[PDB]
Amino acid sequence: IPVVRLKFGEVAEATSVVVLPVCKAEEGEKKILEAPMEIIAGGDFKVVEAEKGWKRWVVLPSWNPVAAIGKGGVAVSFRDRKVLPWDGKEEPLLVVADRVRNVVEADDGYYLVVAENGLKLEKGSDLKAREVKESLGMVVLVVRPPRED
Amino acid sequence: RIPVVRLKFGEVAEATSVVVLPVCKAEEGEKKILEAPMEIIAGGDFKVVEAEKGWKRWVVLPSWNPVAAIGKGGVAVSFRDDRKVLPWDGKEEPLLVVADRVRNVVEADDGYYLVVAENGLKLEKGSDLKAREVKESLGMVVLVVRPPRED
């Protein structure tokens, strides 16, 4: 379950890049259910065509787990909420999920579900004990902000 | 003056910086171009595009100088392949024209601009548009993208 840093052009096995619709985690499950499901690149310039309009979009490198999704991919934004105001703030995060694989099946796996306010990730095994069989989608990759020195 | 670039196969996957633009098919006329989102500047740590109205058709280009410079108002307009008179010479290439909708007011004499055509849309020269007293256009042409060929 890869936690990678945003850098472009260094997945030297990739011919393309990947375009995803984005949701705010704070905005809840409706938006995630509504984001376009099919994003189809075609033509000489790989013009991408969703089947439905959407306002938020993101480009990511064709990382192995990102490119495997195809149908149902979405990117979800998480922001931070520290007790001590002088503590180093935890980086914002971009969680890539697979809505087609919404079915809880891997005990190791991690799934996106509704939180008291917003969304949260939860381990497969924890969801089974909680009697949940349907999540909003399998977490396939996490993106941390670009970094250097 | 106007940069005309050929995209190489694999060039956007090899780029270290990238821009997303909303696409309009030229044949679909000006209603579509006016509808395209304007606020397409990529923000946050992840360069998430957060537009003002939803849009289904997008394209990723390497962040070339003139494309990055546009900011708000950028759009890429597809022109499909026209049939040549002699069919065995193949189709004439598809084309992406990248326009600056913020700079629609006709100002450059050697600049080029997107105006309404009978068949869809045309590029017209700034000097020419000034002579006909056309003050506004659909957008200043900033860049032309030729598709990747074999040879």
PDB file of C-alpha atoms in Angstrom:
ATOM      1  CA  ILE A   1       0.000   0.000   0.000  1.00  0.00           C
ATOM      2  CA  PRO A   2       2.339   2.692  -1.418  1.00  0.00           C
ATOM      3  CA  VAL A   3       2.797   6.131   0.144  1.00  0.00           C
ATOM      4  CA  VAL A   4       4.564   8.126  -2.557  1.00  0.00           C
ATOM      5  CA  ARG A   5       5.805  11.675  -3.066  1.00  0.00           C
ATOM      6  CA  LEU A   6       4.482  13.765  -6.018  1.00  0.00           C
ATOM      7  CA  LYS A   7       7.138  13.775  -8.763  1.00  0.00           C
ATOM      8  CA  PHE A   8       6.539  13.707 -12.516  1.00  0.00           C
ATOM      9  CA  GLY A   9       8.468  11.967 -15.249  1.00  0.00           C
ATOM     10  CA  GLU A  10      10.233   9.383 -13.123  1.00  0.00           C
ATOM     11  CA  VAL A  11       7.926   6.404 -13.670  1.00  0.00           C
ATOM     12  CA  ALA A  12      10.025   5.683 -16.793  1.00  0.00           C
ATOM     13  CA  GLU A  13       7.859   2.649 -17.680  1.00  0.00           C
ATOM     14  CA  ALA A  14       4.776   4.818 -18.325  1.00  0.00           C
ATOM     15  CA  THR A  15       3.570   6.123 -21.683  1.00  0.00           C
ATOM     16  CA  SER A  16       0.914   8.377 -20.171  1.00  0.00           C
ATOM     17  CA  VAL A  17      -0.113  10.138 -17.045  1.00  0.00           C
ATOM     18  CA  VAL A  18      -3.420   9.748 -15.091  1.00  0.00           C
ATOM     19  CA  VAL A  19      -6.266  12.234 -14.675  1.00  0.00           C
ATOM     20  CA  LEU A  20      -8.642  11.874 -11.723  1.00  0.00           C
ATOM     21  CA  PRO A  21     -11.676  13.647 -10.290  1.00  0.00           C
ATOM     22  CA  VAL A  22     -11.038  14.938  -6.775  1.00  0.00           C
ATOM     23  CA  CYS A  23     -13.238  15.072  -3.662  1.00  0.00           C
ATOM     24  CA  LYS A  24     -12.805  16.855  -0.350  1.00  0.00           C
ATOM     25  CA  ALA A  25     -12.972  14.302   2.487  1.00  0.00           C
ATOM     26  CA  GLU A  26     -14.830  16.903   4.579  1.00  0.00           C
ATOM     27  CA  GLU A  27     -17.619  16.992   1.935  1.00  0.00           C
ATOM     28  CA  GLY A  28     -18.766  13.391   2.597  1.00  0.00           C
ATOM     29  CA  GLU A  29     -19.932  10.335   0.685  1.00  0.00           C
ATOM     30  CA  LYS A  30     -22.340  11.986  -1.788  1.00  0.00           C
ATOM     31  CA  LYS A  31     -19.598  13.681  -3.805  1.00  0.00           C
ATOM     32  CA  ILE A  32     -17.600  10.453  -3.981  1.00  0.00           C
ATOM     33  CA  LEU A  33     -20.632   8.568  -5.264  1.00  0.00           C
ATOM     34  CA  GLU A  34     -21.201  11.313  -7.847  1.00  0.00           C
ATOM     35  CA  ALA A  35     -17.668  11.912  -9.255  1.00  0.00           C
ATOM     36  CA  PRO A  36     -17.341  10.628 -12.874  1.00  0.00           C
ATOM     37  CA  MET A  37     -16.622   6.879 -13.044  1.00  0.00           C
ATOM     38  CA  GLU A  38     -15.174   6.598 -16.563  1.00  0.00           C
ATOM     39  CA  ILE A  39     -12.333   8.720 -17.784  1.00  0.00           C
ATOM     40  CA  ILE A  40     -11.338   7.780 -21.282  1.00  0.00           C
ATOM     41  CA  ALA A  41      -8.215   9.047 -23.088  1.00  0.00           C
ATOM     42  CA  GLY A  42      -8.363   8.886 -26.862  1.00  0.00           C
ATOM     43  CA  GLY A  43      -7.111  10.556 -30.048  1.00  0.00           C
ATOM     44  CA  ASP A  44      -3.613  11.787 -30.869  1.00  0.00           C
ATOM     45  CA  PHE A  45      -3.402  14.135 -27.875  1.00  0.00           C
ATOM     46  CA  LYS A  46      -4.955  11.717 -25.346  1.00  0.00           C
ATOM     47  CA  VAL A  47      -7.833  14.129 -24.730  1.00  0.00           C
ATOM     48  CA  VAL A  48      -9.572  12.666 -21.747  1.00  0.00           C
ATOM     49  CA  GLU A  49     -13.392  12.362 -21.714  1.00  0.00           C
ATOM     50  CA  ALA A  50     -15.471  11.902 -18.574  1.00  0.00           C
ATOM     51  CA  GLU A  51     -19.077  10.758 -19.011  1.00  0.00           C
ATOM     52  CA  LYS A  52     -20.253  13.511 -16.635  1.00  0.00           C
ATOM     53  CA  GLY A  53     -18.997  16.999 -15.720  1.00  0.00           C
ATOM     54  CA  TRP A  54     -16.926  17.645 -12.593  1.00  0.00           C
ATOM     55  CA  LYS A  55     -15.189  20.722 -11.136  1.00  0.00           C
ATOM     56  CA  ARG A  56     -12.103  19.327  -9.384  1.00  0.00           C
ATOM     57  CA  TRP A  57      -9.378  17.448 -11.210  1.00  0.00           C
ATOM     58  CA  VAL A  58      -5.837  16.190 -10.618  1.00  0.00           C
ATOM     59  CA  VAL A  59      -3.024  14.741 -12.724  1.00  0.00           C
ATOM     60  CA  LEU A  60      -0.827  12.030 -11.288  1.00  0.00           C
ATOM     61  CA  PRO A  61       2.075   9.930 -12.608  1.00  0.00           C
ATOM     62  CA  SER A  62       1.006   6.540 -13.995  1.00  0.00           C
ATOM     63  CA  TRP A  63       2.131   4.690 -10.849  1.00  0.00           C
ATOM     64  CA  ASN A  64       1.520   0.968 -11.032  1.00  0.00           C
ATOM     65  CA  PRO A  65      -1.468   0.971  -8.598  1.00  0.00           C
ATOM     66  CA  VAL A  66      -2.949   4.202 -10.017  1.00  0.00           C
ATOM     67  CA  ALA A  67      -2.908   2.907 -13.616  1.00  0.00           C
ATOM     68  CA  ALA A  68      -4.367  -0.478 -12.644  1.00  0.00           C
ATOM     69  CA  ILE A  69      -7.716   1.060 -11.563  1.00  0.00           C
ATOM     70  CA  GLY A  70      -9.263   2.251 -14.829  1.00  0.00           C
ATOM     71  CA  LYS A  71     -12.978   2.581 -14.030  1.00  0.00           C
ATOM     72  CA  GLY A  72     -14.009   4.166 -10.699  1.00  0.00           C
ATOM     73  CA  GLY A  73     -10.797   5.914  -9.668  1.00  0.00           C
ATOM     74  CA  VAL A  74     -11.053   9.061  -7.560  1.00  0.00           C
ATOM     75  CA  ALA A  75      -8.622  11.202  -5.515  1.00  0.00           C
ATOM     76  CA  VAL A  76      -9.712  12.315  -2.045  1.00  0.00           C
ATOM     77  CA  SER A  77      -8.200  15.314  -0.167  1.00  0.00           C
ATOM     78  CA  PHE A  78      -7.408  15.287   3.541  1.00  0.00           C
ATOM     79  CA  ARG A  79      -6.339  18.367   5.499  1.00  0.00           C
ATOM     80  CA  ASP A  80      -5.313  18.830   9.170  1.00  0.00           C
ATOM     81  CA  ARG A  81      -5.935  19.643  13.792  1.00  0.00           C
ATOM     82  CA  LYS A  82      -3.062  19.563  16.327  1.00  0.00           C
ATOM     83  CA  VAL A  83      -3.574  19.854  20.089  1.00  0.00           C
ATOM     84  CA  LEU A  84      -0.466  21.956  20.719  1.00  0.00           C
ATOM     85  CA  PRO A  85      -0.471  24.906  18.348  1.00  0.00           C
ATOM     86  CA  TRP A  86       3.356  24.935  18.151  1.00  0.00           C
ATOM     87  CA  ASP A  87       3.692  21.294  17.014  1.00  0.00           C
ATOM     88  CA  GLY A  88       4.850  20.700  13.419  1.00  0.00           C
ATOM     89  CA  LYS A  89       1.701  20.354  11.297  1.00  0.00           C
ATOM     90  CA  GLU A  90       1.055  17.078   9.491  1.00  0.00           C
ATOM     91  CA  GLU A  91       1.111  17.301   5.718  1.00  0.00           C
ATOM     92  CA  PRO A  92      -2.108  17.341   3.673  1.00  0.00           C
ATOM     93  CA  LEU A  93      -2.803  14.110   1.828  1.00  0.00           C
ATOM     94  CA  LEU A  94      -4.233  12.813  -1.433  1.00  0.00           C
ATOM     95  CA  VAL A  95      -5.757   9.353  -1.154  1.00  0.00           C
ATOM     96  CA  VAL A  96      -6.392   7.475  -4.362  1.00  0.00           C
ATOM     97  CA  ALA A  97      -9.313   5.038  -4.180  1.00  0.00           C
ATOM     98  CA  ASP A  98     -11.096   2.486  -6.361  1.00  0.00           C
ATOM     99  CA  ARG A  99     -14.893   2.751  -6.242  1.00  0.00           C
ATOM    100  CA  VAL A 100     -15.426  -0.389  -8.309  1.00  0.00           C
ATOM    101  CA  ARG A 101     -13.646  -2.342  -5.587  1.00  0.00           C
ATOM    102  CA  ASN A 102     -16.042  -0.989  -2.929  1.00  0.00           C
ATOM    103  CA  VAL A 103     -16.506  -4.537  -1.511  1.00  0.00           C
ATOM    104  CA  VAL A 104     -14.615  -5.244   1.759  1.00  0.00           C
ATOM    105  CA  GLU A 105     -12.517  -8.357   1.117  1.00  0.00           C
ATOM    106  CA  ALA A 106      -8.875  -7.882   2.147  1.00  0.00           C
ATOM    107  CA  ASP A 107      -8.123  -8.033   5.887  1.00  0.00           C
ATOM    108  CA  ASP A 108      -4.824  -6.265   5.261  1.00  0.00           C
ATOM    109  CA  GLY A 109      -6.562  -3.819   2.867  1.00  0.00           C
ATOM    110  CA  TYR A 110      -7.800  -0.320   3.663  1.00  0.00           C
ATOM    111  CA  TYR A 111     -11.126   1.163   2.690  1.00  0.00           C
ATOM    112  CA  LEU A 112     -12.761   4.546   2.512  1.00  0.00           C
ATOM    113  CA  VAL A 113     -15.887   4.986   4.710  1.00  0.00           C
ATOM    114  CA  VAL A 114     -18.045   7.746   6.258  1.00  0.00           C
ATOM    115  CA  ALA A 115     -16.648   9.536   9.337  1.00  0.00           C
ATOM    116  CA  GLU A 116     -18.521  11.521  12.012  1.00  0.00           C
ATOM    117  CA  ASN A 117     -17.473  14.530   9.977  1.00  0.00           C
ATOM    118  CA  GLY A 118     -16.205  13.723   6.497  1.00  0.00           C
ATOM    119  CA  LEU A 119     -14.550  10.460   5.532  1.00  0.00           C
ATOM    120  CA  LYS A 120     -11.968   8.160   7.033  1.00  0.00           C
ATOM    121  CA  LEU A 121      -9.842   5.196   6.087  1.00  0.00           C
ATOM    122  CA  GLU A 122     -10.401   1.916   7.899  1.00  0.00           C
ATOM    123  CA  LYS A 123      -8.619  -1.491   7.877  1.00  0.00           C
ATOM    124  CA  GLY A 124     -10.544  -4.361   6.269  1.00  0.00           C
ATOM    125  CA  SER A 125     -10.470  -6.517   9.429  1.00  0.00           C
ATOM    126  CA  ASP A 126     -11.845  -3.626  11.541  1.00  0.00           C
ATOM    127  CA  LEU A 127     -14.750  -3.217   9.073  1.00  0.00           C
ATOM    128  CA  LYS A 128     -15.632  -6.901   9.196  1.00  0.00           C
ATOM    129  CA  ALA A 129     -15.818  -6.848  13.011  1.00  0.00           C
ATOM    130  CA  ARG A 130     -18.045  -3.791  12.638  1.00  0.00           C
ATOM    131  CA  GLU A 131     -20.297  -5.790  10.231  1.00  0.00           C
ATOM    132  CA  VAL A 132     -19.535  -3.589   7.169  1.00  0.00           C
ATOM    133  CA  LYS A 133     -19.329  -5.284   3.761  1.00  0.00           C
ATOM    134  CA  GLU A 134     -19.634  -2.166   1.574  1.00  0.00           C
ATOM    135  CA  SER A 135     -17.173   0.730   1.598  1.00  0.00           C
ATOM    136  CA  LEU A 136     -17.007   3.675  -0.814  1.00  0.00           C
ATOM    137  CA  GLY A 137     -13.749   2.207  -2.168  1.00  0.00           C
ATOM    138  CA  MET A 138     -10.444   0.437  -1.738  1.00  0.00           C
ATOM    139  CA  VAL A 139      -7.469   2.635  -0.905  1.00  0.00           C
ATOM    140  CA  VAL A 140      -4.793   1.853  -3.525  1.00  0.00           C
ATOM    141  CA  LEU A 141      -2.238   4.646  -2.990  1.00  0.00           C
ATOM    142  CA  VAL A 142      -1.487   7.694  -0.888  1.00  0.00           C
ATOM    143  CA  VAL A 143       0.199  10.841  -2.205  1.00  0.00           C
ATOM    144  CA  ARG A 144       2.268  13.137   0.046  1.00  0.00           C
ATOM    145  CA  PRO A 145       3.160  16.703  -1.168  1.00  0.00           C
ATOM    146  CA  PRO A 146       6.195  17.289  -3.507  1.00  0.00           C
ATOM    147  CA  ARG A 147       9.497  17.307  -1.590  1.00  0.00           C
ATOM    148  CA  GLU A 148      13.222  17.929  -2.159  1.00  0.00           C
ATOM    149  CA  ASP A 149      15.492  19.643   0.440  1.00  0.00           C
TER     150      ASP A 149
ATOM    151  CA  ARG B   1       6.067  34.443 -33.183  1.00  0.00           C
ATOM    152  CA  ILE B   2       3.335  31.848 -32.461  1.00  0.00           C
ATOM    153  CA  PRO B   3       5.069  28.657 -31.240  1.00  0.00           C
ATOM    154  CA  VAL B   4       4.179  25.538 -33.184  1.00  0.00           C
ATOM    155  CA  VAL B   5       5.206  22.431 -31.273  1.00  0.00           C
ATOM    156  CA  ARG B   6       5.048  18.781 -32.181  1.00  0.00           C
ATOM    157  CA  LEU B   7       4.230  16.546 -29.249  1.00  0.00           C
ATOM    158  CA  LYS B   8       6.506  13.506 -29.025  1.00  0.00           C
ATOM    159  CA  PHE B   9       5.114  10.110 -28.071  1.00  0.00           C
ATOM    160  CA  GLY B  10       5.812   9.835 -24.333  1.00  0.00           C
ATOM    161  CA  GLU B  11       6.637  13.513 -23.890  1.00  0.00           C
ATOM    162  CA  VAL B  12       3.968  14.228 -21.224  1.00  0.00           C
ATOM    163  CA  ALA B  13       4.948  11.059 -19.247  1.00  0.00           C
ATOM    164  CA  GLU B  14       8.575  12.307 -19.361  1.00  0.00           C
ATOM    165  CA  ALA B  15       7.723  15.894 -18.366  1.00  0.00           C
ATOM    166  CA  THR B  16       8.531  17.010 -14.825  1.00  0.00           C
ATOM    167  CA  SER B  17       5.849  19.699 -14.867  1.00  0.00           C
ATOM    168  CA  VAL B  18       2.396  19.489 -16.442  1.00  0.00           C
ATOM    169  CA  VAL B  19      -0.710  21.587 -17.291  1.00  0.00           C
ATOM    170  CA  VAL B  20      -4.344  20.562 -17.638  1.00  0.00           C
ATOM    171  CA  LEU B  21      -6.584  22.443 -20.043  1.00  0.00           C
ATOM    172  CA  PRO B  22     -10.267  22.125 -20.787  1.00  0.00           C
ATOM    173  CA  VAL B  23     -10.876  21.063 -24.391  1.00  0.00           C
ATOM    174  CA  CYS B  24     -13.430  22.270 -26.918  1.00  0.00           C
ATOM    175  CA  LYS B  25     -14.030  20.666 -30.269  1.00  0.00           C
ATOM    176  CA  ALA B  26     -13.750  23.484 -32.863  1.00  0.00           C
ATOM    177  CA  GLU B  27     -16.648  22.113 -34.946  1.00  0.00           C
ATOM    178  CA  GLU B  28     -18.931  22.718 -31.920  1.00  0.00           C
ATOM    179  CA  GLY B  29     -18.789  26.494 -32.364  1.00  0.00           C
ATOM    180  CA  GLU B  30     -18.532  29.358 -29.920  1.00  0.00           C
ATOM    181  CA  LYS B  31     -21.277  28.315 -27.480  1.00  0.00           C
ATOM    182  CA  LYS B  32     -18.980  25.598 -26.161  1.00  0.00           C
ATOM    183  CA  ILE B  33     -15.880  27.811 -25.811  1.00  0.00           C
ATOM    184  CA  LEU B  34     -17.880  30.408 -23.865  1.00  0.00           C
ATOM    185  CA  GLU B  35     -19.075  27.600 -21.561  1.00  0.00           C
ATOM    186  CA  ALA B  36     -15.615  26.182 -20.765  1.00  0.00           C
ATOM    187  CA  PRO B  37     -14.421  26.905 -17.199  1.00  0.00           C
ATOM    188  CA  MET B  38     -12.210  29.965 -16.734  1.00  0.00           C
ATOM    189  CA  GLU B  39     -10.722  29.400 -13.264  1.00  0.00           C
ATOM    190  CA  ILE B  40      -8.512  26.477 -14.242  1.00  0.00           C
ATOM    191  CA  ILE B  41      -5.355  27.416 -12.267  1.00  0.00           C
ATOM    192  CA  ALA B  42      -3.953  24.372 -10.429  1.00  0.00           C
ATOM    193  CA  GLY B  43      -3.716  25.039  -6.666  1.00  0.00           C
ATOM    194  CA  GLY B  44      -2.556  23.448  -3.417  1.00  0.00           C
ATOM    195  CA  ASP B  45       0.359  21.082  -2.898  1.00  0.00           C
ATOM    196  CA  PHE B  46      -1.075  18.685  -5.457  1.00  0.00           C
ATOM    197  CA  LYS B  47      -1.890  21.194  -8.186  1.00  0.00           C
ATOM    198  CA  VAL B  48      -5.577  20.247  -7.954  1.00  0.00           C
ATOM    199  CA  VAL B  49      -7.560  22.145 -10.588  1.00  0.00           C
ATOM    200  CA  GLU B  50     -10.593  23.738  -8.908  1.00  0.00           C
ATOM    201  CA  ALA B  51     -12.882  25.159 -11.620  1.00  0.00           C
ATOM    202  CA  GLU B  52     -16.124  27.213 -11.264  1.00  0.00           C
ATOM    203  CA  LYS B  53     -18.356  24.917 -13.395  1.00  0.00           C
ATOM    204  CA  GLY B  54     -17.986  21.217 -14.302  1.00  0.00           C
ATOM    205  CA  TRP B  55     -16.448  20.096 -17.598  1.00  0.00           C
ATOM    206  CA  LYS B  56     -16.044  16.634 -19.185  1.00  0.00           C
ATOM    207  CA  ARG B  57     -13.254  17.147 -21.682  1.00  0.00           C
ATOM    208  CA  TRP B  58      -9.619  17.790 -20.674  1.00  0.00           C
ATOM    209  CA  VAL B  59      -6.019  17.349 -21.963  1.00  0.00           C
ATOM    210  CA  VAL B  60      -2.590  17.211 -20.307  1.00  0.00           C
ATOM    211  CA  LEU B  61       0.306  19.072 -21.839  1.00  0.00           C
ATOM    212  CA  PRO B  62       3.845  19.558 -20.588  1.00  0.00           C
ATOM    213  CA  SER B  63       4.125  22.991 -18.888  1.00  0.00           C
ATOM    214  CA  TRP B  64       5.789  24.758 -21.800  1.00  0.00           C
ATOM    215  CA  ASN B  65       6.574  28.404 -21.172  1.00  0.00           C
ATOM    216  CA  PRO B  66       3.651  30.099 -23.044  1.00  0.00           C
ATOM    217  CA  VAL B  67       1.094  27.561 -21.813  1.00  0.00           C
ATOM    218  CA  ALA B  68       2.024  27.995 -18.127  1.00  0.00           C
ATOM    219  CA  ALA B  69       1.967  31.805 -18.608  1.00  0.00           C
ATOM    220  CA  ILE B  70      -1.745  31.921 -19.540  1.00  0.00           C
ATOM    221  CA  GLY B  71      -3.153  31.207 -16.070  1.00  0.00           C
ATOM    222  CA  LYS B  72      -6.934  31.778 -15.979  1.00  0.00           C
ATOM    223  CA  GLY B  73      -8.791  31.597 -19.295  1.00  0.00           C
ATOM    224  CA  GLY B  74      -6.694  28.942 -20.998  1.00  0.00           C
ATOM    225  CA  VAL B  75      -8.451  26.469 -23.263  1.00  0.00           C
ATOM    226  CA  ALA B  76      -7.286  24.017 -25.954  1.00  0.00           C
ATOM    227  CA  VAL B  77      -9.385  23.778 -29.070  1.00  0.00           C
ATOM    228  CA  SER B  78      -9.384  20.584 -31.161  1.00  0.00           C
ATOM    229  CA  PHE B  79      -9.416  20.763 -34.923  1.00  0.00           C
ATOM    230  CA  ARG B  80     -10.015  17.289 -36.381  1.00  0.00           C
ATOM    231  CA  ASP B  81      -8.472  15.765 -39.497  1.00  0.00           C
ATOM    232  CA  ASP B  82      -9.844  17.122 -42.758  1.00  0.00           C
ATOM    233  CA  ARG B  83      -9.833  14.749 -45.737  1.00  0.00           C
ATOM    234  CA  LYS B  84      -7.257  15.688 -48.388  1.00  0.00           C
ATOM    235  CA  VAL B  85      -8.519  15.873 -51.971  1.00  0.00           C
ATOM    236  CA  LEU B  86      -6.404  12.801 -52.742  1.00  0.00           C
ATOM    237  CA  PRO B  87      -7.398  10.239 -50.095  1.00  0.00           C
ATOM    238  CA  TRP B  88      -4.356   7.982 -50.543  1.00  0.00           C
ATOM    239  CA  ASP B  89      -2.237  10.829 -49.130  1.00  0.00           C
ATOM    240  CA  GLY B  90      -3.967  10.283 -45.781  1.00  0.00           C
ATOM    241  CA  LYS B  91      -5.797  12.771 -43.582  1.00  0.00           C
ATOM    242  CA  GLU B  92      -4.524  16.232 -42.750  1.00  0.00           C
ATOM    243  CA  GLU B  93      -3.292  16.148 -39.106  1.00  0.00           C
ATOM    244  CA  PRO B  94      -5.549  16.795 -36.101  1.00  0.00           C
ATOM    245  CA  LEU B  95      -4.568  19.964 -34.244  1.00  0.00           C
ATOM    246  CA  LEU B  96      -4.739  21.386 -30.721  1.00  0.00           C
ATOM    247  CA  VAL B  97      -4.923  25.166 -30.664  1.00  0.00           C
ATOM    248  CA  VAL B  98      -4.259  26.622 -27.195  1.00  0.00           C
ATOM    249  CA  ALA B  99      -6.044  29.949 -26.577  1.00  0.00           C
ATOM    250  CA  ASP B 100      -6.043  32.704 -23.917  1.00  0.00           C
ATOM    251  CA  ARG B 101      -9.658  33.758 -23.269  1.00  0.00           C
ATOM    252  CA  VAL B 102      -8.600  36.527 -20.887  1.00  0.00           C
ATOM    253  CA  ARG B 103      -6.801  38.199 -23.811  1.00  0.00           C
ATOM    254  CA  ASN B 104      -9.754  38.139 -26.241  1.00  0.00           C
ATOM    255  CA  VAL B 105      -9.631  41.887 -26.911  1.00  0.00           C
ATOM    256  CA  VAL B 106      -7.834  42.244 -30.242  1.00  0.00           C
ATOM    257  CA  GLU B 107      -4.493  43.925 -29.680  1.00  0.00           C
ATOM    258  CA  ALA B 108      -1.520  42.330 -31.479  1.00  0.00           C
ATOM    259  CA  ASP B 109      -1.085  43.018 -35.211  1.00  0.00           C
ATOM    260  CA  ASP B 110       0.906  39.850 -35.735  1.00  0.00           C
ATOM    261  CA  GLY B 111      -1.054  37.983 -33.107  1.00  0.00           C
ATOM    262  CA  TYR B 112      -3.759  35.523 -34.090  1.00  0.00           C
ATOM    263  CA  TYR B 113      -7.230  35.104 -32.715  1.00  0.00           C
ATOM    264  CA  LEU B 114     -10.098  32.679 -32.602  1.00  0.00           C
ATOM    265  CA  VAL B 115     -13.249  33.963 -34.246  1.00  0.00           C
ATOM    266  CA  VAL B 116     -16.492  32.303 -35.360  1.00  0.00           C
ATOM    267  CA  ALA B 117     -16.411  30.508 -38.747  1.00  0.00           C
ATOM    268  CA  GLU B 118     -19.197  29.047 -40.917  1.00  0.00           C
ATOM    269  CA  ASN B 119     -17.902  25.464 -40.392  1.00  0.00           C
ATOM    270  CA  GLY B 120     -16.925  25.970 -36.704  1.00  0.00           C
ATOM    271  CA  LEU B 121     -14.080  28.389 -35.757  1.00  0.00           C
ATOM    272  CA  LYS B 122     -11.193  30.148 -37.470  1.00  0.00           C
ATOM    273  CA  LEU B 123      -7.855  31.700 -36.649  1.00  0.00           C
ATOM    274  CA  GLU B 124      -7.717  35.284 -37.961  1.00  0.00           C
ATOM    275  CA  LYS B 125      -4.883  37.822 -37.886  1.00  0.00           C
ATOM    276  CA  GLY B 126      -5.001  40.745 -35.441  1.00  0.00           C
ATOM    277  CA  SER B 127      -4.257  43.305 -38.159  1.00  0.00           C
ATOM    278  CA  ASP B 128      -7.175  41.965 -40.267  1.00  0.00           C
ATOM    279  CA  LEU B 129      -9.664  42.006 -37.357  1.00  0.00           C
ATOM    280  CA  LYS B 130      -8.753  45.612 -36.574  1.00  0.00           C
ATOM    281  CA  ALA B 131      -9.628  46.601 -40.162  1.00  0.00           C
ATOM    282  CA  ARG B 132     -13.144  45.105 -39.907  1.00  0.00           C
ATOM    283  CA  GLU B 133     -13.658  46.804 -36.509  1.00  0.00           C
ATOM    284  CA  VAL B 134     -14.008  43.477 -34.628  1.00  0.00           C
ATOM    285  CA  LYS B 135     -12.869  44.407 -31.107  1.00  0.00           C
ATOM    286  CA  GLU B 136     -13.502  41.232 -29.137  1.00  0.00           C
ATOM    287  CA  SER B 137     -12.716  37.655 -30.101  1.00  0.00           C
ATOM    288  CA  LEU B 138     -13.033  34.225 -28.474  1.00  0.00           C
ATOM    289  CA  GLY B 139      -9.357  34.230 -27.457  1.00  0.00           C
ATOM    290  CA  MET B 140      -5.764  35.024 -28.370  1.00  0.00           C
ATOM    291  CA  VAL B 141      -3.909  32.144 -29.900  1.00  0.00           C
ATOM    292  CA  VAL B 142      -0.958  31.354 -27.658  1.00  0.00           C
ATOM    293  CA  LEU B 143       0.263  27.945 -28.939  1.00  0.00           C
ATOM    294  CA  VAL B 144      -0.329  25.263 -31.608  1.00  0.00           C
ATOM    295  CA  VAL B 145       0.245  21.525 -30.959  1.00  0.00           C
ATOM    296  CA  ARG B 146       0.886  19.071 -33.802  1.00  0.00           C
ATOM    297  CA  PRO B 147       0.247  15.370 -33.030  1.00  0.00           C
ATOM    298  CA  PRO B 148       3.039  12.741 -32.723  1.00  0.00           C
ATOM    299  CA  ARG B 149       3.820  11.135 -36.108  1.00  0.00           C
ATOM    300  CA  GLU B 150       5.852   7.969 -36.977  1.00  0.00           C
ATOM    301  CA  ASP B 151       8.790   9.166 -39.148  1.00  0.00           C
TER     302      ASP B 151
END
